[PDB]
C-alpha cells in the first residue's frame, strides 16, 4: 500500500467525503474526516439525492451499503404539469425500475455513511481555514481548534471551497440562472391543493422562463425549487425577509394557478442561491508541494439540472480509492494524477450536459 506509514485528511463530511473515508478505511488506510458541522445531528437543508446504477450505486456497492441505501430510499413517480395545474404526463415507478434511482434524504444518507465508519473517524466542529505545506506533511489550520497534520489532503468541502489554491487557481463562476428553495411541513395541511397535484410523485412545471420542481415527500416535508434566469437588475430581493421573496415570486407567478401561489404564500423561509460551476476548463497544477487533490463538488461543481451532481462525485471516490489502494503506482502523486485524468473526462462530459440542459430549459419556449 502507497499510504502504509501515512495518514489522509479528508476536508468535509458530505456524501462524497464520507464515501471517500469509507472506501479508504476498508483498505486499512488511516483517514480522518474534518467536518465544519457542529455534530452529527445538524440538519442538512436541501432536496433528496438519487444514486444511479453504474456510478453512485457502484460506490455504495463497493462500500457494502447498497442494500442499506435501498432500505431507506423511496422510489418516486414524476408528474409534469402546466401553470394551470393540468397534469400533462404521469410516469409511475414500475416494479422492475424500482432500484434505478430511489430518492434518499440527505441526513438519511449521511447516517448510513457515518455508521459504516470506525468510531472517531469524523471530527466535528472542524472548519478548515488554512492549509500549509511542510517538509513531509501538510499543516491544517482549524478555526479555534487544534491544528493537525496529514500526508495527503483530499478536499471534499463542496463547491465554494476556499482552500483550493495549491491544486488550481480556477474560480467558481455564476452561470446566469438562480434557484430559490424551501421546505413546507405538513404539506397535506399547509399546501393541500399542491400536495394533491403531486399525488405522491415528484412534480415539474415550466412557464415563461420560470421552472418549478417539487418532491412532496422528503421524510414528510415537501421540498420545492423555483429556478429562473437571473434578472438583470441583480440581490434586489432580500432572502432574510420572507415578505420581499414572497412579493417577487407572486409577481413572477401571477399567471400560475392558485395552488402554486398557495405554495409560495405558506412557506416560512426561502433560500436563494445563484447557480454556479467550477469549470474543468484547464489542467490543474502539475507543480505541487505535497500530495493534495479534490473530489465531489470541490472538483467539478455544476448546475443541478440533469441530475449530474453527487454521482460523479461518488465515482471520484471510487476511482481515487482504488488508485490509492494498490502498489499499482510508484507514488501517491501518480495515483492522484491518474484519478485526475479520468475525472476530467467524465467530469467535463457531465458539465457539458448540465450546461447544455441549463441553456435548453431556460429557452423562453421550453416544454418538458
Ligand atoms: C438546489 C440543488 C439541487 C440539487 N439537486 C441534486 C439532485 O437532485 N441530485 C444530485 O445528484 N445532486 C444534486 N445537487 C448537487 C448535490 O447536492 C451535490 O453534488 C452534492 O451534495 C455534492 O456532494 P459533496 O460531498 O461534494 O459536497 P457537499 O454536499 O457540499 O458537502 C461538503 C461538506 O463539507 C463541509 N464543509 C464545507 N466547508 C468546510 C470546511 N472549511 N471545513 C470542513 N468542512 C467543510 C460542509 O459542511 C459539507 O458538509 C443539487 C444541488 C443544489 C445546489
Ligand atoms: C432536464 N431536467 C428536467 C432534468 C433532467 C434529469 N435527467 C437527466 O438529465 C438524465 N440524462 C439522460 C436523459 C439519461 C441522458 C434529471 O435527473 C433532473 C432534471 C430536473 C432537476 C431539477 C432539480 C432542482 N434543483 C435545480 C434545485 C429541484 O429544485 C428539485 C426538487 N425536487 O425540488 C429536483 O428534483 C432537481 O434536484 C432534480 O433532481 C432534477 C433532476 O433530477
From Swiss-Prot:
Subcellular localization, as worded in the UniProt entry: Cytoplasm
UniProt: NADPH binding residues: 43
InterPro entries: FAD-bd, FAD/NAD-bd_sf, TetX_monooxygenase
Cofactor mode of binding and number, as noted: Binds 1 FAD per subunit, which helps bind the antibiotic substrate.
GO MF term list: FAD binding; monooxygenase activity
EC number: 1.14.13.231
Residue positions binding FAD: 15-16, 34-37, 50, 106, 128, 297, 307-310
Keywords from the named record: Antibiotic resistance, Cytoplasm, FAD, Flavoprotein, Monooxygenase, NADP, Nucleotide-binding, Oxidoreductase, Transposable element
Other comment: Encoded in a conjugative transposon. Immediately upstream of this gene is an N-terminally truncated tetX1 gene that is inactive. Tetracycline antibiotics bind to the ribosomal acceptor site (A-site), preventing binding of the aminoacyl-tRNA to the A-site. The hydrophilic side of tetracycline makes many hydrogen-bonding interactions with oxygen atoms of the ribosome's phosphate backbone.
Subunit structure: Monomer.
Functional summary from the UniProt entry: An FAD-requiring monooxygenase active on tetracycline antibiotic derivatives, which leads to their inactivation. Hydroxylates carbon 11a of oxytetracycline and tigecycline. Acts on many tetracycline analogs (chlorotetracycline, demeclocycline, doxycycline, minocycline, oxytetracyclinee), probably by monooxygenization. Tigecycline, a new generation tetracycline antibiotic, is rendered less effective against E.coli by this monooxygenation, is much weaker at inhibiting translation in vitro and binds Mg(2+) considerably less well. Expression in E.coli BW25113 reduces its growth rate about 5%.
Name of the protein described by the UniProt record: Flavin-dependent monooxygenase
Annotated source species: Bacteroides thetaiotaomicron
Organism placement in taxonomy: Bacteria, Pseudomonadati, Bacteroidota, Bacteroidia, Bacteroidales
Gene: tetX2
Amino acid at each position: 500500500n502507497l499510504l502504509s506509514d501515512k495518514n489522509v485528511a479528508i476536508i468535509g463530511g458530505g456524501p462524497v467525503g464520507l464515501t471517500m473515508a469509507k472506501l479508504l478505511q476498508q483498505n486499512g488506510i488511516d483517514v480522518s474526516v474534518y467536518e465544519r458541522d457542529n455534530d452529527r445531528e445538524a440538519r442538512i437543508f436541501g432536496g433528496t439525492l438519487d444514486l444511479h446504477k453504474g456510478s453512485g450505486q457502484e460506490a455504495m456497492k463497493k462500500a457494502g451499503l447498497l442494500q442499506t441505501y435501498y432500505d431507506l430510499a423511496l422510489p418516486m413517480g414524476v408528474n409534469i404539469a402546466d401553470e394551470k395545474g393540468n397534469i400533462l404526463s404521469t410516469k409511475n415507478v414500475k416494479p422492475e425500475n424500482r432500484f434505478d434511482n430511489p430518492e434518499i434524504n440527505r441526513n438519511d444518507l449521511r447516517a448510513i455513511l457515518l455508521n459504516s465508519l470506525e468510531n472517531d473517524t469524523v471530527i466535528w466542529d472542524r472548519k478548515l481555514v488554512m492549509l500549509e505545506p511542510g517538509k513531509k506533511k501538510w499543516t491544517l489550520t482549524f478555526e479555534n481548534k487544534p491544528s493537525e497534520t496529514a500526508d495527503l489532503v483530499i478536499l471534499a468541502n463542496g463547491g465554494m471551497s476556499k482552500v483550493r489554491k495549491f491544486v488550481t487557481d480556477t474560480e467558481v463562476e455564476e452561470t446566469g440562472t438562480f434557484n430559490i428553495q424551501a421546505d413546507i411541513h405538513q404539506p397535506e395541511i399547509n399546501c393541500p391543493g399542491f400536495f394533491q397535484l403531486c399525488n405522491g410523485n415528484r412534480l415539474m412545471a415550466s412557464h415563461q422562463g420560470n421552472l418549478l420542481f417539487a418532491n412532496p415527500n422528503n421524510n414528510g416535508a415537501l421540498h420545492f425549487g423555483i429556478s429562473f434566469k437571473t434578472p438583470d437588475e441583480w440581490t434586489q430581493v432580500d432572502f432574510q425577509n420572507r415578505n420581499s421573496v414572497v412579493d417577487f415570486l407572486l409577481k413572477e407567478f401571477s399567471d400560475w394557478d392558485k395552488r402554486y401561489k398557495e405554495l409560495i404564500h405558506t412557506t416560512l423561509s426561502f433560500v436563494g442561491l445563484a447557480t454556479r460551476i467550477f469549470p474543468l476548463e484547464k489542467p490543474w497544477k502539475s507543480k505541487r508541494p505535497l500530495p493534495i487533490t479534490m473530489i465531489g463538488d470541490a472538483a467539478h461543481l455544476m448546475p443541478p439540472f440533469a441530475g449530474q451532481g453527487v454521482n460523479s462525485g461518488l465515482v471520484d471516490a471510487l476511482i481515487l480509492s482504488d488508485n490509492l489502494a494498490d502498489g499499482k503506482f510508484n507514488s501517491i502523486e501518480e495515483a492522484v494524477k491518474n484519478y485526475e485524468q479520468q475525472m476530467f473526462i467524465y467530469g467535463k462530459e457531465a458539465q457539458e450536459e448540465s450546461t447544455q440542459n441549463e441553456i435548453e430549459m431556460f429557452k423562453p419556449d421550453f416544454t418538458f
